[PDB]
Amino acid sequence: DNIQGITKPAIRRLARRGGVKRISGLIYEETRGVLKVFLENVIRDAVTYTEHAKRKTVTAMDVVYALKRQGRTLYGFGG
Amino acid sequence: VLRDNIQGITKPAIRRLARRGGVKRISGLIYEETRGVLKVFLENVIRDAVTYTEHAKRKTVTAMDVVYALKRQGRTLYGFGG
Amino acid sequence: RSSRAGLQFPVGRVHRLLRKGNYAERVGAGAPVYMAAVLEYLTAEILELAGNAARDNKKTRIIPRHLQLAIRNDEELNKLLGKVTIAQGGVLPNIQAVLLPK
Amino acid sequence: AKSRSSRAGLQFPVGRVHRLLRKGNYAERVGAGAPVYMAAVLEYLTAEILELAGNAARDNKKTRIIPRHLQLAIRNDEELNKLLGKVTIAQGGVLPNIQAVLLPK
Amino acid sequence: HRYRPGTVALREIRRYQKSTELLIRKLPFQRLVREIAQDFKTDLRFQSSAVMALQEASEAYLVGLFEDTNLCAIHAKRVTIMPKDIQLARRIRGER
Amino acid sequence: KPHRYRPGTVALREIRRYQKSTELLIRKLPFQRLVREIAQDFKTDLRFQSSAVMALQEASEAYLVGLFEDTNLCAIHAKRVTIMPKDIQLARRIRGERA
Amino acid sequence: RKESYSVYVYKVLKQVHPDTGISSKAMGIMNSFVNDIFERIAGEASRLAHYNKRSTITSREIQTAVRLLLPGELAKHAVSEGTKAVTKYTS
Amino acid sequence: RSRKESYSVYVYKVLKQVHPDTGISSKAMGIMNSFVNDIFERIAGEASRLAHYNKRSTITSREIQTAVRLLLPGELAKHAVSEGTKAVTKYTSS
DNA sequence: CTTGTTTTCCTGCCTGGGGGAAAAGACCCTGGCATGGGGAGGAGCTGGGCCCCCCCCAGAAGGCAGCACAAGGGGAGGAAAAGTCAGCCTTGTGCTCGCCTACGGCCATACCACCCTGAAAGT
DNA sequence: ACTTTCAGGGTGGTATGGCCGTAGGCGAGCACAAGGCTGACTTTTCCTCCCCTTGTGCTGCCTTCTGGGGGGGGCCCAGCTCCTCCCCATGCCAGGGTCTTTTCCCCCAGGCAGGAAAACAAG
């Protein structure tokens, strides 16, 4: 139960980065659900890569491969 | 033949496409907006197909070239080979 | 080899495609056998539904419209073929509840 | 030993790029002008983003390009944003923009 | 007798959503395609299957775009689709 | 009367502050716990690199910002200034993530 | 001549829909379906070896290629079919 | 330990050529490597598919040109193609 | 509109910390040699894509009646914003244990090249 | 229905991978503050949601007239095949030039304090 660690101030800060000026009271739960779905999608691919490599730790390379497999290629963390 | 053929996409045709989409009522500017949208989309796809043809040194655009051009944009097209 | 492993798909042909497709420098002799079964399963899956749709229309032949309807009705198949433009397939009949007359 | 990079005028790895092409399994054979073209293209794409991020840094009175400058260059130039539209850049943030509706009258 | 505005709309929607044929006129569409390709390359040939494929691609793309435009119009609490809805759909999709 | 700012100026100042920074707006320890409890559903006794976690977080803190921008555009379209779950749903359904 | 999967797909229908037929246009749809999918599983297993510094594409990489690209229940049945094929093949 | 490879020295040389008074961080130097490798994968895959379409056996500068033309938009593709062409002509004709 | 009042930005000073240069190594870049093989070119061929002819009839375009729907204006109530205060918990540090992973060595068997043929599929 | 093209059985080699030994770099785990961030409360202000109205643009209908669908035919350039052989790319080895990892120190970025400026809001 650590999705609540994505706090209302945190979601509000993300919205302010996104240009949102006013925020409804039900936006936070929806954003938490969306974040959970995105993280599930990325981490399933990362864990599958790790299992294929016969490794026990997910690597930044596994994460980048998982992100690249969903059209979300990430820069910086290797390549 | 080579001038002002976009109007060949007539108002009834655009309304028919809208009815297939699910549109219940249509504004008067929708026709010109859709015409411009199709112009740009066809520009992109046809550019990709023409490049895919010029590589093969061919002079005829084929279903192979069209399907390759469309697939390299995400929109895979079935039924015409490949 | 296809008869040995029980596939209606060509093990030799898929092996040749793997070797000539330039995917790697060596291709093990279990990749064609796995592929000619995965492709077979996928085709059977999108053939059963696209013939059930034809049955739901009192037809005996499968048409691209039936294929499109089956693909769009199936959940996983639609997700996999999310960007597939099928010619002569049309679109699913979908009228929003709001637009329906009160 | 005369390096192909110096003979052509490039700065990227003509030889190692050829080796990666051959080991990358992109074709049974690889032409002699293939890596030269590819290295030239990659070096030009590098020298575009690097120049733009240097301009972004100079506009910030800085002299050490960080990821923020790279993203400010890429998302401010219309072409590289199109090329990298599905690319996430670490430690770069977002562009500064506000919708005119939310601004006070 | 005349039907109230809207029942004909739903009937038209149903009729063209239960159909598969090409809703654009083939000859003017082909003329448009040749007009577009002329700028890319003069003296360009074409195939009947190629033009048919281009037409089906453009038609399916337009039909999807119109579903998204109708979604935007319903979001704005409306029934009449407008350039505003088209632009919102295209921007959120990422084509603009 | 004690000084107070009318609603909107502090929000706009927050926007201007957080669009000029590059930091991470989610706390690292709870995001690590979230990542690890999600990965627990795919592989038990799994281990994570610091770079792996900080590369998952960086992806999240841009996905959510993009979604918020599209939701804000939806809210502006619907003649409103407050973003809403229906606007988020419309944004996601249009970009195709989930219908 | 153009080799195709029309003969093979025509036989997988007879074991699932033994009485219905396939129109010629539908035959061209599925030839595009198999060919496009084949370029996706093979292209996924090609990158896996590159990441893994390996050299031979095997059944261990086709499995990872399939379960990466196929959603949900599709992967759990596509992997199951292939495993039963190689197992029978060697045996 | 192992010897790891990258494009860091070449990036640094072109960066000193284009910006003779400014620097770059070790995070932007970890971004540029990923950028170079991603573009490499893009163009290499496109050229491979382009050569396999025409039933050709060898990737050639012509297929690289076509892949650039199909991957980069507008002036990006124009200038990339021009630079690659000039590089190949100067290399081969030397 | 003045003015009090916050919040932010510039300038200066101290500091820490990470990038740019120096030094050695270790790994494959390039040159030299021998060689098979794929594609550039020239000829033949054939087929389909363009252009034109004719017709006609279904659909588009223009005009009108009429009608219902979007956009402006009004009101109210309720729900976020902003500020305040109390609490708690990230996190920066320090420290340890132990695991796992990249390397290294040796060898074991699966794959590639090749020779022939009989069978499978495409017209 | 024939054929012609390609996949299968057998041989030989070797190179890629499988298994055991290893050592160390980093990942997990545990205290410990303690200030920075987060949670609950309150005022209230402004935003959202409904309602009315209207005029105006959209829709339903009719009629006419076009120009798209439906063939039929000629031809002539463009896409496919076949064979030659030659120039390009490949396999192998030798030596060094370049790229790679460690070391350091100094200039650039970070933190803080002081003051000035620029918006905000009641008034």
Author numbering:
A (entry chain F): 24 to 102
B (entry chain B): 21 to 102
C (entry chain G): 17 to 118
D (entry chain C): 14 to 118
E (entry chain A): 39 to 134
F (entry chain E): 37 to 135
G (entry chain H): 33 to 123
H (entry chain D): 31 to 124
Give the original sentences from the paper that presented this experimental model.
pmcThe specific interaction of proteins with the nucleosome is central to the regulation of chromatin function and dynamics. The tardigrade damage suppressor (Dsup) and vertebrate high-mobility group N (HMGN) proteins bind specifically to nucleosomes via a conserved motif whose structure has not been experimentally determined. Here we used cryo-EM to show that both proteins bind to the nucleosome acidic patch via analogous arginine anchors with one molecule bound to each face of the nucleosome. In addition, to study nucleosome structure in the context of active chromatin, we analyzed nucleosomes that were reconstituted with a promoter-containing DNA sequence from a Xenopus borealis somatic 5S rDNA gene.
To assess the effect of the 10 bp linkers on the flexibility of the core nucleosomal DNA in these structures, we next analyzed a sample of the 147 bp 5S rDNA nucleosome. In the absence of linkers, the 147 bp nucleosome core particle adopts the closed and open I conformations seen with the 167 bp 5S rDNA nucleosomes. However, we did not observe a state analogous to open II, indicating that the flexibility of the core 5S rDNA increases in the presence of linker DNA. Notably, most nucleosomes in our 147 bp (∼60%) and 167 bp (∼95%) data sets adopted unwrapped conformations, agreeing with the increased breathing dynamics of natural DNA sequences compared with the synthetic 601 DNA. Modeling of the 5S rDNA in the 147 and 167 bp nucleosome structures revealed that DNA unwrapping is more prominent on the end that is downstream from the TSS. First, the downstream end lacks density in both the open I and open II 5S rDNA nucleosome conformations, whereas the upstream end exhibits high flexibility only in the open II state. Second, the lack of DNA density is greater at the downstream end (beyond superhelical location [SHL] +4.5 in open I and open II) relative to the upstream end (beyond SHL −6 in open II). In contrast, in the two open states of the 5S rDNA nucleosomes, R77 of H2A near the downstream DNA end adopts a conformation that is not compatible with a fully wrapped DNA turn.
